[PDB]
Structure 1
Amino acid sequence: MNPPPPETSNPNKPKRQTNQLQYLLRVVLKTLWKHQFAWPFQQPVDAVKLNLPDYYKIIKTPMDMGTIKKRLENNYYWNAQECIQDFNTMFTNCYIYNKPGDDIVLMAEALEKLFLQKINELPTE
């Protein structure tokens, strides 16, 4: 069964726009989105659809690139590091829920490498 997806707005949280956050949307997220292995990560895990009734019994901090994209579009984050943490949570969730060598894990491994390549150098303020 599915919990509510992670919030993409929160009026009690302050918003911010920075050059680095703009880059995380325009270049990092939007390039990863087009990778051949991006599709499992473009929306919250639908445990009912995918017949993964254990998914949210295991994964307590779910995250995906659809949520990240909406957060970036909504200026939800304070800084680039907060957004980067959401990407890292997404990848770690995949490693936690699965096991080494699974096709889904090979996909996450490739995307994580591309992600790190792209965030190695960010624009300055």
Structure 2
Amino acid sequence: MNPPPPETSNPNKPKRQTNQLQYLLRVVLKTLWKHQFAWPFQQPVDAVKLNLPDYYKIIKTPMDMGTIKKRLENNYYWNAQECIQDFNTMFTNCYIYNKPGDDIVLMAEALEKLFLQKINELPT
């Protein structure tokens, strides 16, 4: 079945809140969340429901915007770069599992371009 979801808290990890990390939540994630193509990325891939029994055979560092949102809400990250790496893992996993031009990939590519637009300029 499905693996445990990625952690959204960790008391051994030091927490921080920066202007940039608040912006990644309130502006970047909250607007990506509203996109019509966001729904596949709002929660961990349910390989059992989706009948993708090889998914977690191939994807060993899963990530999703639901997990990122909870991390941001928990101040789980030390800096904005940690959060941006999670977004990139999410996108890269989708391009690894799937193939150019697949419906799910076109959705990921639309979100990625939007994501790149929004982090082009972060607050001070």
Q: Distance in 1 between matches of 2:77 and 2:51?
A: 32
| Aligned match of 1:48 | 48
Q: Distance in 2 between matches of 1:52 and 1:70?
A: 25
Q: Distance in 2 between matches of 1:35 and 1:49?
A: 23
Q: CA deviation at 1:85?
A: 0.2
Q: CA deviation at 1:38?
A: 0.1
The DSSP-based 3-state class of the residue aligned with 1:47 is coil
Q: Distance in 1 between matches of 2:24 and 2:70?
A: 12
Which consecutive segments of 4 or more residues in structure 1 shift more than 3 A? none
Q: CA deviation at 1:105?
A: 0.3
CA RMSD of aligned residues (A): 0.3
Q: List alignment gaps of at least 5 residues for structure 1.
A: none
The DSSP-based 3-state class of the residue aligned with 1:44 is coil
Q: Distance in 2 between matches of 1:111 and 1:12?
A: 32
Q: Distance in 1 between matches of 2:10 and 2:49?
A: 28
Q: CA deviation at 1:33?
A: 0.3
Q: Distance in 1 between matches of 2:24 and 2:54?
A: 31
Q: CA deviation at 1:26?
A: 0.1
Q: CA deviation at 1:81?
A: 0.2
- Provide TM-score, normalisation by structure 2: 0.99
Aligned residue runs from structure 1 range 17-56, under 5 A: 17-56=17-56
Q: Distance in 2 between matches of 1:101 and 1:49?
A: 23
Q: CA deviation at 1:113?
A: 0.2
Q: Deviations over 1:16-61 (max 9, x none)?
A: 0000000000000000000000000000001111111000000000
Q: Distance in 2 between matches of 1:98 and 1:63?
A: 15
Structure 1 vs Structure 2: percent identity of aligned residues?
100
Q: CA deviation at 1:88?
A: 0.3
Q: Deviations over 1:51-110 (max 9, x none)?
A: 110000000000000000000000000000000000000000000000001000000000
- Provide TM-score, normalisation by structure 1: 0.99
Q: Distance in 2 between matches of 1:96 and 1:122?
A: 28
| Aligned match of 1:106 | 106
